[PDB]
Design a protein around this ligand. Structure first.
Ligand SMILES: CC[C@H](C)CN(C[C@@H](O)[C@H](Cc1ccccc1)NC(=O)O[C@H]1CO[C@H]2OCC[C@H]21)S(=O)(=O)c1ccc2c(c1)OCO2
Lengths: 99, 99
């Protein structure tokens, strides 16, 4: 597909067995999802943005489907205001910026 | 160009006659640049990111050339971790996401 940027590039993703709306975010190195009680082992991490840092839980090798395209990789879970699909998964679903 | 996302999508911009490196950030509504001087009136504004809210200076109708493509629009100056080009200017240069 082609997604214009007149509005926030929000798409439907599936992780665990929840459907969520998430931003396709070229400015995000990593994928950061809103607080959810995901099973499995995790490691603590801090990530920084506008305003400062938040504490997140890093889970590895988590399958996520992004608009019907399969991906699997690291997801960070924490008190973000929005679900963010970062470059780690965007490359996996074949996503490019074009102008 | 077509820009893949295995690396951060950093580009050279020209603003106020100066060259800077900035991040094409589809997850950003607004364009936010690190502390710098720009001419003309600005107004105090606050914006929120992943880590909380910051104070910025809002400059309106500012020319910026992004990777050779002209935009003229709102630029926010403040304590962002990195220069970010957001959707207000990405739309002007005809940037879309494609997968
Ligand atoms: C360091 C470069 C960016 C500022 C990083 N941010 C991704 C942004 O796309 C972020 C994504 C975002 C979007 C909404 C809320 C919070 C975060 N947008 C953002 O802060 O935009 C602000 C400017 O425009 C405004 O519109 C949206 C918020 C404002 S981030 O969310 O803090 C972020 C995401 C994944 C990360 C990360 C930081 O560090 C490692 O992995």
């Amino acid at each position: 597909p082609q997604i214009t940027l007149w509005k926030r590039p929000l798409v439907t993703i599936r992780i665990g067995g929840q459907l969520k709306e998430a931003l396709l975010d070229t400015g995000a190195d990593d994928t950061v999802l809103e607080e959810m009680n995901l099973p499995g082992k995790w490691k603590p991490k801090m990530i920084g943005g506008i305003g400062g840092f938040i504490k997140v839980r890093q889970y590895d090798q988590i399958p996520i489907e992004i608009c019907g395209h399969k991906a699997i990789g690291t997801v960070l879970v924490g008190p973000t205001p929005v679900n963010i699909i970062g470059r780690n998964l965007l490359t996996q679903i074949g996503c490019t910026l074009n102008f």
